[PDB]
Amino acid sequence: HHWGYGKHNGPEHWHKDFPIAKGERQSPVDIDTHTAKYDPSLKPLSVSYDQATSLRILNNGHAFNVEFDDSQDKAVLKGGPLDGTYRLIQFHFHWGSLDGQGSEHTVDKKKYAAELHLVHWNTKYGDFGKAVQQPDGLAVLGIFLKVGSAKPGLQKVVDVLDSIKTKGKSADFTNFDPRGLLPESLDYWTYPGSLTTPPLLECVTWIVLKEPISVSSEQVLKFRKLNFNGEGEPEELMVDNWRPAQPLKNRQIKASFK
Numbered sequence: 539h540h541w542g543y544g545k546h547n548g549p550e551h552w553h554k555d556f557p558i559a560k561g562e563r564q565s566p567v568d569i570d571t572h573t574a575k576y577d578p579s580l581k582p583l584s585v586s587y588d589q590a591t592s593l594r595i596l597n598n599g600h601a602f603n604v605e606f607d608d609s610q611d612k613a614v615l616k617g618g619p620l621d622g623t624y625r626l627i628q629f630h631f632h633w634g635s636l637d638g639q640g641s642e643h644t645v646d647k648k649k650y651a652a653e654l655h656l657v658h659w660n661t662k663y664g665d666f667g668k669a670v671q672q673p674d675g676l677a678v679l680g681i682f683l684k685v686g687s688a689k690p691g692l693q694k695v696v697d698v699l700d701s702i703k704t705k706g707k708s709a710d711f712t713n714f715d716p717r718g719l720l721p722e723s724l725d726y727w728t729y730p731g732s733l734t735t736p737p738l739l740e741c742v743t744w745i746v747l748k749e750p751i752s753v754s755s756e757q758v759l760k761f762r763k764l765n766f767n768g769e770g771e772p773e774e775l776m777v778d779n780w781r782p783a784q785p786l787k788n789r790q791i792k793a794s795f796k
C-alpha cells in the first residue's frame with residue numbers, strides 16, 4: 539500500500555509513516571486575511587521565467603508534474619521573503635471533484651477549485667535532494683484557480699493530459715512557457731511551511747498569490763479525467779488530491795501588500 543487521498547490512505551493516515559505530519563510548520567494553512575500583517579521588510583518579488591526549459595509531463599499517481607531543466611539559472615524566483623536564488627524544478631496542481639473544493643491553502647476558510655504549485659529549490663544547496671534537507675531549501679509559489687473564463691496559457695497542458703492518463707505515463711513537454719499561468723498581480727502572502735504531500739518535509743517558504751487565475755469549467759473537467767491508478771488497474775479518477783489546512787501553530791502569515 540502507499541499513501542494517497544482515499545479513505546484508507548489519505549491525509550488522516552499519513553502520520554503513521556510520516557510523523558512530521560503532526561509537526562510545527564506543516565502546510566497548507568488557512569490564510570486569515572485579517573490576522574495577516576503587511577511586512578515592510580519584504581523586498582520586491584521577482585519571477586524570472588523567460589529562459590525556462592520545460593522537458594516532460596508525468597502522471598506520478600498523485601498529480602501531474604511539468605518538469606524543467608534546472609541545471610542553470612533558467613527560471614528563477616528571487617526577492618520577496620527569499621534570500622538568494624531559487625530555481626524552478628516542476629509545477630503541478632491540486633484540484634477537486636467539484637468546483638467548490640480543490641485548493642490546499644484556503645483564504646478566510648474559502649476553498650478554490652484548484653491550486654497551482656511552482657516548486658523551486660535554493661541554489662546554495664546545489665541539488666534538490668540536498669535542498670530538502672534544509673529549513674530554507676525550497677520556495678513554492680502557490681496560485682489559486684477559480685472556474686470562469688478559460689486560461690489560454692493552460693490549454694497546452696490540458697491537451698496533453700490524454701497522453702498521460704494513468705500513473706507512470708509521461709510525455710515529452712518542451713517549450714512550455716509557465717508565465718502563461720500567472721495572474722496580473724504578484725501581491726502575496728508568505729509563511730514558513732512544508733511539502734503538502736509525503737514526506738511532508740519542513741523546508742518550504744510558501745508564497746501564495748492573492749489574485750486567483752480563472753480557468754474554464756472544460757479545463758478543470760479534463761484534469762478530473764486523469765487516473766490515480768496505473769494502466770490495467772481499477773479506474774480511480776484523480777480528483778480531490780488536496781491536503782486540508784493544518785494548524786498554524788507558532789507562525790505568522792505576512793502580506794506583501796497594504
Ligand SMILES: NS(=O)(=O)c1ccc(C(=O)NCc2cccc(O)c2)cc1
Nearest residue numbers: 539540541546547551552553554555556
Ligand atoms: N503512508 S501512509 O502512512 O499514509 C499509509 C500506508 C499504508 C496504508 C495502508 O496500508 N492502507 C490500506 C489500504 C487499503 C485499501 C486501499 C489503500 O490505498 C490502502 C495507508 C497509509
Ligand SMILES: NS(=O)(=O)c1ccc(C(=O)NCc2cccc(O)c2)cc1
Nearest residue numbers: 593598603605606607608609627628666
Ligand atoms: N532532471 S529534471 O531537472 O527535469 C527533474 C528531475 C527531477 C524532478 C522532480 O520532480 N523530483 C522530485 C521527485 C522525487 C522523487 C520522485 C520523483 O518522480 C520526483 C523534476 C525535474
Ligand SMILES: NS(=O)(=O)c1ccc(C(=O)NCc2cccc(O)c2)cc1
Nearest residue numbers: 655657670678732733734735736737739
Ligand atoms: N505540494 S508541494 O508543492 O508542497 C510539493 C512539492 C514537491 C514535492 C516533492 O518533490 N516530492 C518528492 C520528494 C521530495 C523530497 C524527498 C523525497 O523522497 C521525495 C512534494 C510536494
Ligand SMILES: [Zn+2]
Nearest residue numbers: 631632655734
Ligand atoms: Zn503541491
